[PDB]
Every structure is written in C-alpha cells, then in structure tokens.
Amino acid sequence: AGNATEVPANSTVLSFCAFAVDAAKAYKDYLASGGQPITNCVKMLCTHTGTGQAITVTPEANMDQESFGGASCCLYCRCHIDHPNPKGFCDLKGKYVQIPTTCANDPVGFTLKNTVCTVCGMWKGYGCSCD
C-alpha cells in the first residue's frame, strides 16, 4: 500500500541527513567527501523567458537558469526533518526556485549555500545587480 516518493540513488544521503544533528553541515560534508548530489528534483519544462527572480509563484527561469519546484530543492523538505527557524516553516515549499544552469546538477546544495537579495529578489553572486 502507498506510493513511492524516492529512488534508491538518494537513500544513503537522505538517511545520513535525516539522522544528523546539523543536516545542512551533514549534506555539505557528504558532498565534500565525494558523495553524489540529491537527484529526483522537480525540474520544470518552461519557456526560459522569465524574470530571473530566485523564488517565484510561477516558473521565472531566464536563458541562464533552470526552474524547479521549491520543496524538491529544500534539504529539510527532502529529509522530512525540522526547518531551522523558530516558526518551523519553509520559504521554498509552495514556490518555484530558479537555479543557475551551471549549478543545476545540485539544486538542494545551491539553495543551502546561497542567499536571495532582499532588495532585487535575485541570488547573490548570480544575478544580484546591487552592490
């Protein structure tokens, strides 16, 4: 009974991060030890004529980005663990995330390590026009 949500290639990384005290440090250490990035993300078929903003209500990828469903890019959503804030809520789940094409091999790792500019809504170091 029930419907599978995962593939066997993700078992090791998800099990490791699901038991960790610090899951974010666990995933970065997993990658640093040669471990494969989390796969089976929700990659979107989109026009690539979007605004380029980082977190959007609809896919907004430009020609240098890939759009993904937000929950699928969140380590906490992928591992079914607590989100690291007092309210315990997610900023990616229920939204779409634009990831640079060069980093689309690891969408979970990208959102973990990067921040969105509060002023222009673009990723810092990847489209943020502010100084």
Next chain:
Amino acid sequence: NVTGLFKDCSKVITGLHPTQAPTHLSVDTKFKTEGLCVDIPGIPKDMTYRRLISMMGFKMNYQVNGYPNMFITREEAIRHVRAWIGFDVEGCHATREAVGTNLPLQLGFSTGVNLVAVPTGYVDTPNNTDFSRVSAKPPPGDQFKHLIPLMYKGLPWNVVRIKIVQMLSDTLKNLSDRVVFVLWAHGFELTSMKYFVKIGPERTCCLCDRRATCFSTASDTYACWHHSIGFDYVYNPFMIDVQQWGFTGNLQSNHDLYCQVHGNAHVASCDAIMTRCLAVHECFV
C-alpha cells in the same frame, strides 16, 4: 526503480502540486510531460493536506570523513562487548488516514525494560513535516493480542526518548564509553532509532573529557553517560545485525540451540534479551 524510504502512505488519489512535491515521482500525473513537469495556471496548490511519510527503508552506508559508522564489524562489536544492549521493537500499523507503514509501539531492551510509545509518524503538510500522533492498529494476529491494551498505555515520544537515554546512561556509565545495539533483522529497529538518535562528528562531554554519547536539543549540548540527566537524544550509537551472520532460521530457534534459560514471553524486551544472548554464545564459544 523506487525505494520504500519516504513512501507516501496517504489515501489521497491525486499526487502533489509541482511546488509542494518533495520529488518528481510524487508530482501529480497531470503535470508530467517529456520527463519534466509543467506549471498549469488554474490548477492551484493544496493548502490543507496531511500525508504520512514512511520511515521504513533507511540505509546507513555513508562514507563521510569525521563521521563514525553506526554499523560496525563483528570483530569491533566483540572488542566492545561491555557496550552491548540488545534491542527489539514491536510495532503497530498505520490506519484510517494512512496505510503502508509501521510505527514504534513497544521498545524492548536486554536490560529487561519495555517502554510504550504513543503511535507517532512523520506527516507532511503544505508548510513542513509535523511529527505527531497518528491513527494506528496493532498487527492483525493472535500472538500480538498483548499489543491491543498498549495502544492506550503509551507515552509521548519527548518522554520516551528521555527514558531511553536515562536507562542507557544508568546501565553503561561504569561499563563503556559507547552503546552497541545488538539487533536481529535491524530494519524496523533502525526506523525506530530515527525517533531517538542523532549523529554527527565525534564530540566530547560538556562537563568532562569523555566522548559524548548523548545530545540535548533544548541546550544544543553533548554529554557522556555520567552527565546526561535530562538529555533527550542518543548520540553516535553503534549497532550490529546478528541475523546477518549466516543463521538460517528465526531468532528463537537459533537462540534455543545454545540457551535454555530465556523463554519466549513474546514481549519486545524478551527478543532483545535473546538477541544479545545469541550474540554472546556465537561470538565467544
């Protein structure tokens, strides 16, 4: 190919919206095309769902620098025989709003301890994962008729894990700097460990030079077995699966070949006692 780890156990006939689905597999079929997904304006997100996610299928075979391995060799388990604690869990089945997973009900240890927990699962919502009580039924059978009263005699997991840490600390403070759980068909016990175990790099106690065996979420501190009062998590435990040593039959039939003083009272603690006993006889004779 798919795994049973994180299997969606809800009875909802539709899948998830692309923004809420943790994976491509769990996205509803309406949104799938060309090996990708599409956003369909007019088909909105679901803001009220509660989907039970199965914790059956964990695989602790990570190779990460500075993170000790949970599953140890027979030769390393032999060196740490003073740390051996037999462990078994009798579970109950998810029911009503979910079907397809087992939840911890009776946790048994070779120390003779049985702890009853409220049936609790990991339920996905539009905002997060809610660790909460779920509807459950004891396994359909007559050798599990003793589990029916336990459905109403359970304690909340925040209490159960404090009791586990306390029992292990009392038992192991003068015996070892570790815990080695001695298991038989480890699957469900590893699932049950998700409810009271945390892992990471090796740490030291906050009050002494001994290695840390316990963790506290409230203070983000680590403690050895001597200073863990009030701690809620078992930190960096070790374990071994006795079933994997080439035995052909079930636990009781292999145990009974070497020992005639541990009867099968059919309770979780009794299986944990038999598991450790068989491990002792097989390893040291």
